[PDB]
């Protein structure tokens, strides 16, 4: 089912920001080290009738 | 017997509304998002005699434009727009799609993108020096400075297209970037000009509009009306499973 | 006239239109 | 002709067999993501026409439905396209579960029918 | 690189999510197969004569 | 046709890295994203592992 | 030719392979 999908596609986006969060802060003691931040998109989107 | 199909064709389309949902949900972080409305529509038919069957189709008015909060990452070439400002960049096909997103990021040979959809300006697509730092006023004009040269060789370069859209007359895309419906189109032409009202500003970016509270009370009433109709399935076939032994002899 | 009785032309088409033009 | 009931109620019973047969392949191929040769699996159903008046019910032909494949994002598969999109059925769940629920419901309705047909058919076999 | 070890890569997400659809298809699919049997359970009554 | 049986498939695993302790452990190493340590089975042929 | 009609020909065996070759 379709919901099943999706949400799973948003709990895996939301723990890749997690752990791009948690990579920031592990090495906040690097010598020149540049924070990194995550940008998503939004998929393609299905019309099952036009206007 | 047919009451068993409206009622099937009810929690049919409330799943449809859980997924439309659930999709709002999911992207709950992505800059320049527009949440997606839902509504359910109802459908008469008109037979001949005693017209009780009204069916329901789940339907999508479109995106709400209540505009998100913004964080400050003080980056120096992330833009915000106004209440209803919307970047203008070329798509795939050529057609301008307008968007909120004011993440810009800039290509190797200094060509300005917007997730490898090139934004359009004041002419074409834009395109800055090589590798100069970039600046947005408040009101769309690009100043570029070559870096190790003294500070007072900053030149403008370019300037944003920047229009105004209602919000009612703007429908989102397969790929996700709104164009005017027909009449919209019609009345102010093809393609939209450039107004001077919208000011925008450097440094921040917005994120997405997504009700938590709202998105929590449809998916109980979502899961609600599912439970209903689905006790509403039981009753009809078991009735009908009963009413045929008439038919024995 | 009455639902169940007998008539001698058939009943017309049946249509559920999502938004009337 | 009370004979005509018998052929009548048989092709009842076998159009509701092949829509009932039609469906639960359906259910059992919800979730399949691909076919024999990389074609995705599509929902199918069922043609009914009359055999003609009016007559029994025979199943014209098997045809599958033409809506959109709710395709779903997986980048890291061979079947994914250019834009790594794989296509995944479209198949729902609650219009099996009705129609598996209408096509019992009518098979035994028509089994009702032969069964009063043929009782007072052999009734009949013993006039005066 | 020395002195670090690579441990397995499980999706706890996907685990969970594929396990609630196979049980919801499992519960579905008994469905199937008892509206069948009970289906069939009379064609015989109408064989009986 | 209306059947269409349904059968299960693995189509392999998956080469995505799963993450790392620090264990200070002077002979414990990890690879890069496409690496294989190269080990010989019991049946004489040889082996890929991580 | 029609289903449930009576032909003195037998019917190919069905089979159903999983991947074509």
Same mark, same amino acid.
């Given at each position: 089912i379709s919901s099943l999908w999706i949400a799973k596609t948003g709990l895996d986006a939301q723990q890749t920001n997690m752990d791009v969060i948690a990579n920031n802060l592990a090495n906040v003691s690097t010598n020149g080290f540049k924070r990194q931040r995550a940008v998503f998109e939004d998929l393609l989107y299905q019309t099952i009738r036009q206007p | 017997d047919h009451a068993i199909y409206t009622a099937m064709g009810a929690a049919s389309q409330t799943l449809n509304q859980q997924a439309v949902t659930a999709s709002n949900l999911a992207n709950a972080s992505t800059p320049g998002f527009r949440a997606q409305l839902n509504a359910l529509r109802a459908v008469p038919v008109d037979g001949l005699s005693l017209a009780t069957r009204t069916l329901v189709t789940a339907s999508t008015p479109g995106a709400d434009m209540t505009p998100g909060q913004l964080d400050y990452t003080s980056r120096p070439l992330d833009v915000a727009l106004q209440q209803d400002g919307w970047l203008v960049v070329q798509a795939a096909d050529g057609a301008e799609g307008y968007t909120r997103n004011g993440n810009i990021q800039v290509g190797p040979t200094g060509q300005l993108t917007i997730q490898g959809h090139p934004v359009i300006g004041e002419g074409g697509p834009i395109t800055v020096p090589e590798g100069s730092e970039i600046t947005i006023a408040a009101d769309g004009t690009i100043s570029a400075l070559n870096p190790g $040269?003294? @500070? =007072?060789?900053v030149a403008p370069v370019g300037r944003l297209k920047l229009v105004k859209a209602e919000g009612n007359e703007v429908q989102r895309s397969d790929d996700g970037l709104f164009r005017l419906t027909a009449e919209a189109q019609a009345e102010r032409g093809a393609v939209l000009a450039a107004d001077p009202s919208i000011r925008i500003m450097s440094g921040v970016l917005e994120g997405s509009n997504v009700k938590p509270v709202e998105a929590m009370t449809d998916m109980i009433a979502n899961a609600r009306r599912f439970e209903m109709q689905m006790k509403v399935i039981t009753s009809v076939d078991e009735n009908e499973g009963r009413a045929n032994q008439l038919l024995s002899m | 006239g009455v639902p169940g009785a007998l008539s001698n032309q058939p009943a017309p088409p049946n249509e559920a239109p999502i938004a009337t033009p | 002709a009370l004979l005509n009931i018998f052929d009548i109620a048989g092709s009842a019973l076998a159009a509701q067999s092949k829509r009932l047969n039609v469906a639960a392949s359906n259910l059992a191929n919800a979730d399949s993501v691909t076919g024999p040769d990389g074609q995705p699996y599509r929902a199918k159903q069922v043609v009914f026409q009359v055999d003609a008046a009016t007559g029994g019910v025979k199943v014209a032909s098997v045809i599958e439905s033409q809506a959109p494949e709710k395709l779903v994002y997986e980048p890291? =598969? @061979?079947?994914? $396209?250019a834009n790594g999109y794989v296509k995944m059925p479209n198949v729902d769940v609650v219009g099996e579960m009705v129609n598996t629920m209408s096509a019992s419901r009518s098979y035994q309705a028509n089994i009702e029918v032969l069964n009063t047909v043929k009782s007072m058919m052999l009734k009949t076999l013993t006039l005066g």
């Open positions: - | $040269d003294p @500070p =007072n060789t | - | 890291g =598969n @061979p079947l994914a $396209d």
